[PDB]
């Protein structure tokens, strides 16, 4: 079955929305923020500008550990899987479920 | 000064079923475009719990260089697309996320 399950997104950007923590009805912690991405990517041999404000979410207690040093303005690289909602629109509600976060301006040391 | 290269990262690989038959056209400036929607479904885990990751991802294959790898695709086709995402408010809605394909793989090619 897992042949058609590939789902992985790696995206760098600047946190433009301060990381807000919410707790699910069951008491599960979550961290939400928006990542502003701006770059130039390779397309058919040419250079194409790519822009996106990607909402991100870090779900789970232990996963919260990777969001303790981020704030508005932080430049990072999020890796995880995407999920969407119908949103009554042609793909409107997209979200990156973060599994790993890297602070590009740091050396792993908090 | 320019941003560091480390801030440029944008790479997505997604597998799925083409639910929207590919539509092709050539822009007034001579650029060929092929567009379709890829419906993705996968099982994921978070906080030790299970859930399905689902999405109907708009895909576009722009440029002459990568047009060939598309004419063998229709609805029901299981494929894997890799590229970068862009969500410009261009056509309509800043929430219009599009996957610019640079590579596509046929998971079942028999016709």
UniProtKB/Swiss-Prot annotation, chain A:
Disulfide bonds join 52-84. Residues 6-105 form the SSB domain. Changing residue 49 to A: Increased binding to DnaT, loads DnaB replicative helicase. Keywords: Disulfide bond, DNA replication, DNA-binding, Primosome, RNA-binding. Changing residue 59 to A: No change in ssDNA binding, increased displacement of PriB from ssDNA by DnaT fragment, increased binding to DnaT fragment (residues 1-88). Complements a priB deletion in a priA300 mutant in vivo. Gene3D superfamilies: Nucleic acid-binding proteins. GO terms for biological process: DNA replication initiation; DNA replication, synthesis of primer; plasmid maintenance; replication fork processing; response to radiation. This is Replication restart protein PriB. It comes from Escherichia coli (strain K12). The lineage of its organism: Bacteria, Pseudomonadati, Pseudomonadota, Gammaproteobacteria, Enterobacterales.
């Amino acid at each position: 079955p897992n042949s058609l399950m590939t789902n992985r997104l790696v995206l760098s950007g600047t946190v433009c929305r301060a990381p807000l923590r919410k707790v699910s009805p069951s008491g599960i912690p979550h961290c939400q923020f928006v990542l502003e991405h701006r770059s130039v990517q390779e397309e058919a041999g040419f250079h194409r500008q790519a822009w996106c404000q990607m909402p991100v979410i870090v779900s789970g207690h232990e996963n919260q550990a990777i969001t303790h040093s981020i704030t508005v303005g932080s430049r990072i690289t999020v890796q995880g899987f995407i999920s969407c909602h119908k949103a009554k629109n042609g793909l409107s509600k997209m979200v990156l479920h973060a599994e790993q976060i890297e602070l590009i301006d740091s050396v792993d040391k908090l």
